[PDB]
Symmetry: D2
Subunit: 261 residues, 4 copies
C-alpha cells in the first residue's frame, strides 16, 4: 500500500505476540525488512517469522529484555548489522496487572514503570541517537493506550506509565523535529489480543467491555497495524508528536450516550 | 492507494481553492466521485474540474453558501441525484480576519461563527441524516485547525469556532458510533494555500511563521489531503472522534525548544 | 473570607436564579457590590435582592437579554454608573434543550450558540474594553461546563457552545495577560439548580446521574459559588486561562471505575 | 482564611526549601499542624520551623528520602504519632537536570523518575492507605508542573515524570472518590525559588523566561501556597482529579500572542 516503506528497516519490541506480531506482519507485507523481538525463547518468535516468510517478507528475530539497557542497545545494533540501517523504531513491549492502588507493592509498580515507560525511553533513545549521528530522518512510534488519557483504577502503574509516555513522546517530537525525526504515539482501545483472551472469553466480561465502546465492537490487531503502517509512511510526513487513538470512541466518554447526566 | 475509496462519493465544501481543491484532486486520484463546491466564483471551480479530468476522475461542481441552510441541503441532495449516493462529507469552508478582541464587531464575530462552525454543523447534520435514514456507514470529516487547541489572539472568533467544532465532532462521533458513522477532525498547522499567500510572500513573515514550526517548514496542501484520504478509508475503521493534527509539531509548544523556561 | 473582594463591583448575567443567584449572594457576603441581571421581569430578581439585603449587601438589578448587544453594553454601563467602576464580570446566562443532532433545527442550534457562546463573548468584550480603556486589572469569569470537555449527545449545540467558550477564554486570557486581566472558566458538573429540578425529582433519573459522579453526590450551588469567589480574589493572582472543573470527578471517566475495560 | 484548616495535620515532602517551605508556612498561618520533611540537611528544616514559630504555628521536622519506601512509611506514621492523625498529604519533593534526550543516561532518567513520580506514588499510597483504613475523608495534593502538559526538551525525564503524575492523580481521584478522598495536582509555571535562583540571577535568562509568561512576571512561592491552601480546604469540596495551573498563562501558548502564525 505504501510504496515508500519498501526496503525500510523496522524494529518492533515485544513482537512475538499480539499487536507487535500483527505490525510485524503488516510491515512485511509492505515489503519492509523487520526485526522481531522476543524476551525469553524464540518459539513464539518463529511463528511470526514463518508468517513473514509466507508473505515473502524478510526478517530476523532478536532476543532482548527492554528493561535491560544492554539488550536494547544490542537490539538496535542488530538491525543495523543485519540490514545495514534503521528507519522505524516501534516500542511496543508492555505489561499490566490489577491491584488496588493503596495495596500496590513498590515491586509491581516498578515492574510496569520499568517495562512500559523506561523501556520505551531506552528504545527511543537508542533509535534517535542513531538517527542523529547518521543524519537519518527516521521515525519512532510508541505504543500507548487510551489510558494515557483515561484514568484506570486498579492499574495506576499502567496509567502513570502511559501518561508518562505521552509527555516523553511529545518532548522527543519537539526536541528532534528540526532534524526531521517524527515521534508519535498510537493509542489503542480494547483490542483482541492474548493479553485479553481470557477476559473476552467470558461472555459477561466481553459484553461489559463492549458496552464501553461506542462503535460496539472490540477491535482487531490489524486495525492497529493499519495505523502504525500509515504513521511510518511518508503520507504522514507533517505529523509528529500526536497520539492517534484507535479506540472505537472509547475516549469520548461512553457513559454519556443518549444525553445522560 | 486506498482501493476501498473507488466509487465512493465525496462532497467537499469550499473546494474550489486551497485545501479543499487539493483534497478534491486527491480523492479523484483514489477513483472516488467528487462533488466540488463554490460559493460564487464558478471559474475557480471549473479549474479544479479540469485538474480532476487530468487524472481521469469524475466530478461535478455545485454552487452553495454554507451559511444558507437550503444551499447545504441542496449540496447533499445534488450528490445523491448525480451519483446515486453519498459516502464522505467534508466540511472545509472557512474564513478568518484579525481584530483585537475588545474591538471586534458582532458582525465579524457572527460571520466567522456562522461559516466555520454553523456551516460545518449544517453539513454534518445533512450528511448524517442521510446516512441514518439509509443505513449507510458513512463518514464526516471536519476541517479544524491547530487553533481548536492553540489560543489565537486577534482571531478569537476563529478559535471559538474551531474549539466549538471539536466538541461538535466528538459529540456526533459518540452519538452515531453505534451506527458505524465515523466523525473526525483534521487539524492543519500552517499550510501553503491562498489564505496565506500574501503573508508567506513577505520574507520576514515567512521566517516568523517557520520559527513557530518545530519541523521547520510550512506544509503543503498535499500533506493534508493525505490525511483526509486515510481517514476516509477503511484503514481507519476503528478511528472516530479524534482530531488528527498535521502541524509539523506546532501544538507541542515551540517556544520551549532547547529546554527554555 | 477574601478581604480583597470588599468594595469590588461584580456583574453576573442570568443571576436571578440558580448558580448566578448563589454567586450573587456569595459575593455579597464577601462585601462586594453586586449587579444582578434578569431577562424579562424583576420578580425573580427581587428575591435575590432581598437575600442580599439580608446579609447586609448592596446590589441592584438590571434587565438585559445577553443576545441583544445594546443590552449587554447597557448592563456594563449600569454597573459603572451605579457603583462607579467594574471589577469582575461573570458570564453565567445559558440554556439547553435535548434534540437528536440529525433532527436539530437551525433555530434551536442558533438559540443556544447565541446565548451560551456569543452572549459570553459580548459580556467579555464589554468588560475587557472597559478594563483596557481605564487600566484596570479586572477579571472575567465564564461559566462553562464539564461539557466543554465531555461530549454530549442530544446537546450538540450546548457542547459546541462550551467548547467554543473554552477557546474564547484561553484566547482572551493570552491576549490580555500583559495588562493583568485574568480570564478563567468554571466547569460545573451536575449541580442542584432549577435547570435540573424536574430531572432530579424522579428517583430513577437522580440515581442515574449520581452513578455518573465518582464522589457519589450532586453538587450544591454554594460549592460552585465558592470557586467563583476564589478565582475572583487575589489568592488566584497567578491563575489565568484555565478551566477549573468542580464536578465530583465526572471528567475522570466514571465508566472506568473498578478497573473495567 | 480557611477556618476548616484549623487543627488539620498536613505533611509536606521536601518542605525545607522553596514551594514546600512556603506551603508549610501558609498552612501554619491557617492554624494547621505541619510536618516538615528534609532529605539530609537538618539546618534548612530548623529554619522553616523558626518561621512557623514566628506565626505561632505548631510543627515538627522529619528526615526522609522519598525514594526510600521505609522513609515514606515512617514519614506518614510520624505525623500520626505526633499529632494523632493525618488530613492532608502533599507530595512536593522533586528534582531536574538538563541533558539532551539521546545523550541522557539511564541513571539520570531513573533518579528523576524515582523521585518525582515514584516518590509521589509512595506518599500518595501511604496517605490513602491510612485514610481508607480509618474512614477519613482526607486529601492528597501532588505538586506537578506546567510540564505535565508542556513538552520539555532537555528534561524528557522530568516531563515524563509529571505526565505520569497527572494520570496517577486522576486515577487515584477516580478510584477513591467514593470514599470522599480528593486527589488534585497543582501545576506551577516559573516560580521564584532556589531551584531557579541562578537562572533568574542572569538578566538575559530572566528576560527570556519572562517572555514566555503572558502575565509578564515570574510568580512568587506565596502565589502557589495560596492554591494549595484553597485545594485543601472545604471550599474545594467538589473538586477532585484536576490539575490547577498557576502559571501566568504559560500553558496558553505564549508564542501565539499578537495573532502570530
Ligand atoms: N491489547 C490491547 O487491547 C491494548 C490496548 C492498549 C494498549 N496496548 C499496548 O499495546 C502493546 C501490545 O499489547 P498486546 O495486546 O499485544 O499484549 P501482549 O502481551 O500480547 O504483547 C506485549 C509483548 O511484550 C512483551 N514483553 C513484555 N515485557 C517485556 C520485556 N521486559 N522485554 C521484552 N518484551 C517484553 C511480551 O512478551 C509480549 O509479547 C502493549 O504495550 C500494551 O500495553 C494493548
Ligand atoms: N491554510 C492553512 O494554513 C490552514 C490552517 C488551519 C486550518 N485551515 C482551515 O482549512 C480550511 C481550508 O483553508 P484554506 O487554506 O484552503 O483556505 P481557503 O480560503 O483557500 O479555502 C476556504 C474556502 O472556503 C470557501 N468559503 C468561505 N466561506 C464560504 C461559504 N459561506 N460558503 C461556501 N464556501 C465558502 C472559500 O471561497 C474558499 O475556497 C478552512 O476551514 C481553514 O480554516 C487552514
Ligand atoms: N446546573 C448545572 O448543573 C450546570 C452544569 C454545567 C454548567 N451550567 C451552566 O451554569 C449556568 C447557570 O446554570 P443554572 O443551573 O443556574 O441554570 P438556570 O437556568 O437556573 O440559570 C441560567 C439563567 O440564564 C438566564 N438566561 C437565559 N438566557 C438568557 C438571555 N438570553 N439573557 C439573559 N439571561 C438569560 C435564565 O433566565 C436563568 O436565570 C449556565 O450557563 C449553565 O449552562 C450549569
Ligand atoms: N520552582 C518552580 O518554578 C517550579 C515549576 C514547576 C514545578 N515545580 C515543582 O515544585 C516542587 C518544588 O520545587 P521548588 O522550586 O521548591 O524546588 P526545590 O528544589 O527548592 O524544592 C524541592 C525539594 O525537594 C527536596 N528533595 C529532592 N529530592 C528528595 C528526595 N529524594 N527525598 C526528599 N526530599 C527531596 C529538595 O531537598 C528540596 O527541598 C518540585 O516538585 C518541582 O518539580 C517547581
Amino acid at each position: 500500500m505504501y510504496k515508500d516503506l519498501e526496503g525500510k528497516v523496522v524494529v518492533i519490541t515485544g513482537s512475538s505476540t499480539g499487536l507487535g506480531k500483527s505490525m510485524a506482519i503488516r510491515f512485511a507485507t509492505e515489503k519492509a525488512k523487520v526485526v522481531v523481538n522476543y524476551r525469553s525463547k524464540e518459539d513464539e518468535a518463529n511463528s511470526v517469522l514463518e508468517e513473514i516468510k509466507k508473505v515473502g517478507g524478510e526478517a530476523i528475530a532478536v532476543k532482548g529484555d527492554v528493561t535491560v539497557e544492554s539488550d536494547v542497545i544490542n537490539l538496535v545494533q542488530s538491525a543495523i548489522k543485519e540490514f545495514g540501517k534503521l528507519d522505524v523504531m516501534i516500542n511496543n513491549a508492555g505489561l499490566e496487572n490489577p491491584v488496588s492502588s493503596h495495596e500496590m507493592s513498590l515491586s509491581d509498580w516498578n515492574k510496569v514503570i520499568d517495562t512500559n515507560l523506561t523501556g520505551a525511553f531506552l528504545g527511543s533513545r537508542e533509535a534517535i541517537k542513531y538517527f542523529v549521528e547518521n543524519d537519518i530522518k527516521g521515525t519512532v512510534i510508541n505504543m500507548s493506550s487510551v489510558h494515557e488519557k483515561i484514568p484506570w483504577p486498579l492499574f495506576v502503574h499502567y496509567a502513570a506509565s502511559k501518561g508518562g509516555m505521552k509527555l516523553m513522546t511529545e518532548t522527543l517530537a519537539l526536541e528532534y523535529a528540526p532534524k526531521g525525526i517524527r515521534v508519535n504515539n498510537i493509542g489503542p482501545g480494547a483490542i483482541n489480543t492474548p493479553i485479553n483472551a481470557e477476559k473476552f472469553a467470558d461472555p459477561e466480561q466481553r459484553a461489559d467491555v463492549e458496552s464501553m465502546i461506542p462503535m460496539g465492537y472490540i477491535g482487531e490487531p490489524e486495525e492497529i497495524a493499519a495505523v502504525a503502517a500509515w504513521l511510518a509512511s511518508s503520507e504522514a510526513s507533517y505529523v509528529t508528536g500526536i497520539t492517534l487513538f484507535a479506540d472505537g470512541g472509547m475516549t469520548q466518554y461512553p457513559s454519556f450516550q443518549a444525553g445522560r447526566g
